[PDB]
Structures are given as C-alpha cells and as structure tokens.
Design a protein around this ligand. Structure first.
Ligand SMILES: Cc1c2cc(cc1C(=O)Nc1cc(CN3CCN(C)CC3)cc(C3CC3)c1)OCCCCCCCNC(=O)c1ccc3ncc(n3n1)C#C2
Length: 298
C-alpha cells in the first residue's frame, strides 16, 4: 500500500501484447508472462509481466495505481511500462523479474550444488550478497522517503528479484492471497501486516516514514533469516503483544553483530529515535561494497 502522500500514464496497444502463460493469481487479478512488441527500441520483442484486473470500482483504483507507478520510477522500484485500456480486460504492463518475489528467492537459496544458477552461486547466499540485497531495498526506500511517500506494507514478499540479482520494490497484490499468514484480518475486509508494523502503528494507527524504517529493519531480518516469517513462533495476537511491549527479534545466525546493530537502530521504540533510511542505506552499501578482507572478519 503506497498511501503514501489519465494519460499521465503511457498506453500500450492490446495487439502489441501476447500472453504466454499465467505466472500467478490473486483475488483481484492474474499476472501473465507475455511478449510485448515495439515497447523498447533496442528490443524488438521483450518479456513483460501483465496484471489483468478481475472486474466496477476497480477502474478507479486501477487508474490510481497506474498514475502512482508511472510517477514512482527509480532504479530500485519495479519498472512500469504502461496500461492497456484498449477494451477489456484492463491490463497493467510491468517489467518481468525472473526470480519472482524476494521472499521466495530467499527461501530457495537458504540453508541447505543444485541451488546455484546463472545469477546465483551455489548454497546459501553469501554475506556480501545478503548485504547487496538489503542495500538495494534501502535505496528504494530512500527514494520513496525522498518523495515523502509511505509504503504501508514493506516486506520481502513485496520485493522482486531480476536478472543479475537486481532487487526492486513492488507491492503485491497477491500478498493477501496465499501469503495470508503474514496478515491479520481486522474488521471485515481489512488485513494488517502486524509482524512488520511498529508500536505506533499497532497502538495509535499512525504510519509515517519513520514507520517504514522499522518495517525495513524487519525486511533486513527476513533477508538474514533467508525469508523466515518474523515472530513465526507466535500467533498474531502474541506478536501484537510482543511488539507493543518492546520485545525485539533475535539476531539471525547468518547476521553479523555489525548488521544486527543496524536492525536495532531501526527498532527504537520512539520513531524520532530511529535512524533515517538514508543513513541505514549508507551503512549497508558501505558493507555491500566492502572488500572480502573486511567482510570476512565481520
Ligand atoms: C509488482 C506487482 C506485480 C503484481 C501485482 C501488484 C504489483 C505491485 O507492486 N503493485 C503496487 C501497487 C501500489 C498502490 N498502492 C497504493 C494504493 N493501495 C490501496 C494499494 C497499493 C504501490 C506500489 C509501490 C510503488 C511500488 C506497487 O498484482 C498481483 C496479482 C496476483 C498474482 C501475482 C502472483 C505472484 N507473482 C510472481 O511470482 C511474479 C514472478 C515474476 C514477475 N515479474 C514481474 C512481476 N512478477 N511476479 C510482478 C508483479
């Protein structure tokens, strides 16, 4: 949720889009892999991800998000190419990221050869790689915070990984469907990612950019646990109890004390006492680009 405060959006002819197969499904839409012709000059035919809108008040929500996604274009935000309102169904065309969402990617390269591939070394992701993934997400949040936007659902399941392990921020979408365990259903139709939410959000229903750095601290934890659910040993209410009462997540086995200090800095009780996202990224990128000699002794 980017809230977070015709045709500014670009438009793609329906004939230029050729659906290949389904990549996944949500309650509000399906995502397809597709060929998109004449989209980029250098590539005569390129693969894209196409989200098809399920159904009457969604057109308004559709137009909103498209306008948002077109404005929010940065190196670590998922690339948005445009929409196809040329008849129905309404389509949204996005960059395809072959490794899927970051959470799934983390689990498939967690401990535990066979896992290694074109983009990834075998076995568990190295320290340098985990920092590289974390640094990229932070950069994305630095951009969002710079435009004074707020991401109300920052989690690895809402990040995407592409070729060369390029990591970009999105916001599913599908996350409420069969990632359901990550959300707590309040009221009739509201779901809250409580395990990622700071005390002021759970208690006071406030969410600011300072809340995002708390949420990022949790993302940083997800990364170094290779995509483990935060407070996985706790029920939703028990998680609410622990968060509002000041209890913090344990240091992940793969997480160095140097990096765990960055998490704690993101997890200060008082919002104004947390570090800025610009500074968290700064510290992470320094480690990401740090020579092996430096990182080995971490
Ligand atoms: C990337 C993406 C894909 C599919 C989706 C949604 C999204 C997405 O980020 N949207 C989104 C929306 C807002 C609006 N905001 C404000 C107002 N709020 C009220 C709402 C939320 C804000 C932002 C932030 C700026 C970034 C992002 O729809 C999900 C359809 C269900 C099927 C998905 C199945 C699982 N998908 C995969 O496993 C997979 C594999 C490869 C691949 N390449 C590209 C994509 N992709 N996905 C995508 C997407």
């Amino acid at each position: 949720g980017l809230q977070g405060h015709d045709a500014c959006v670009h438009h793609i002819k329906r004939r230029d889009i050729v659906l290949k197969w389904e990549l996944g499904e949500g309650a509000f839409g399906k995502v397809f892999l597709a060929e998109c012709h004449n989209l980029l000059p250098e590539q005569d035919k390129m693969l894209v991800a196409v989200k098809a809108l399920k159904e009457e008040s969604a057109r308004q929500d559709f137009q909103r998000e498209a306008e948002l996604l077109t404005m929010l274009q940065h190196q670590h935000i998922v690339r948005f190419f445009g929409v196809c309102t040329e008849g129905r169904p309404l389509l949204m065309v996005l960059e395809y990221m072959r490794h899927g969402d970051l959470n799934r990617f983390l689990r498939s390269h967690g401990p535990d050869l066979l896992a290694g591939g074109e983009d990834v070394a075998p076995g568990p992701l190295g320290l340098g790689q985990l920092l590289a993934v974390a640094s990229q997400v932070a950069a994305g949040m630095v951009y969002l915070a710079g435009l004074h936007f707020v991401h109300r659902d920052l989690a690895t399941r809402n990040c995407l990984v592409g070729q060369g392990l390029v990591v970009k921020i999105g916001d599913f979408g599908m996350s409420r469907d069969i990632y359901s365990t990550d959300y707590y259903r309040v009221g009739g139709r509201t779901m809250l990612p409580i395990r990622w939410m700071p005390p002021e959000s759970i208690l006071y229903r406030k969410f600011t950019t300072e809340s995002d750095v708390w949420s990022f601290g949790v993302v940083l934890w997800e990364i170094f646990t290779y995509g483990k659910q935060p407070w996985y040993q706790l029920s939703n209410t028990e998680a609410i109890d622990c968060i509002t009462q000041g209890r913090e997540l344990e240091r992940p086995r793969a997480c160095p004390p140097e990096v765990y200090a960055i998490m704690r800095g993101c997890w200060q009780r008082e919002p104004q006492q947390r570090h800025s996202i610009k500074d968290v990224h700064a510290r992470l990128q320094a480690l990401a680009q740090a020579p092996p000699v430096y990182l080995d002794v971490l």
